[PDB]
Design a protein around this ligand. Sequence first.
Ligand SMILES: Nc1cccc2ncccc12
Ligand SMILES: Nc1cccc2ncccc12
Length: 147
Amino acid sequence: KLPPGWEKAMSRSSGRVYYFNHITNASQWERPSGEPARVRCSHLLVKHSQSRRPSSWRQEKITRTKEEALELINGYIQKIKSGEEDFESLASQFSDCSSAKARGDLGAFSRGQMQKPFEDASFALRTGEMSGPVFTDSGIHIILRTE
Ligand SMILES: Nc1cccc2ncccc12
Ligand SMILES: Nc1cccc2ncccc12
């Protein structure tokens, strides 16, 4: 019935059904539509004080809490979904990964190369789809599958 990792849920505020993916943390109103050797993704990383390396090109010492980083991620997702901002623009300005300089593009990769929650979300995304918040040892990611 539902593509890999999708479940039905019910909105607390409106009562209408929606769909949630427990691998990508994506959520949407419409019923989801429905593996390759390699996928290509971009990402926006927000680091926090418990990141493996709590430092980035934006900040020599990253001090924000994980909960604060999640709030920032959620705000970026809202602006991307409304069209107020583009993913690529937010990645270049605010991603704590050096890949910010390439609008978040990481290039193409296979299974076994990236951290596992990132890998699993990337491969479960369909081409053009965006994840919700994905947690790794690096921080919290928004992932966009481009190929
Ligand atoms: N909602 C949350 C997000 C991220 C970290 C947290 N830590 C403690 C309690 C709640 C949290
Ligand atoms: N750290 C990085 C990882 C993957 C791709 C990148 N592209 C440009 C700059 C930094 C990158």
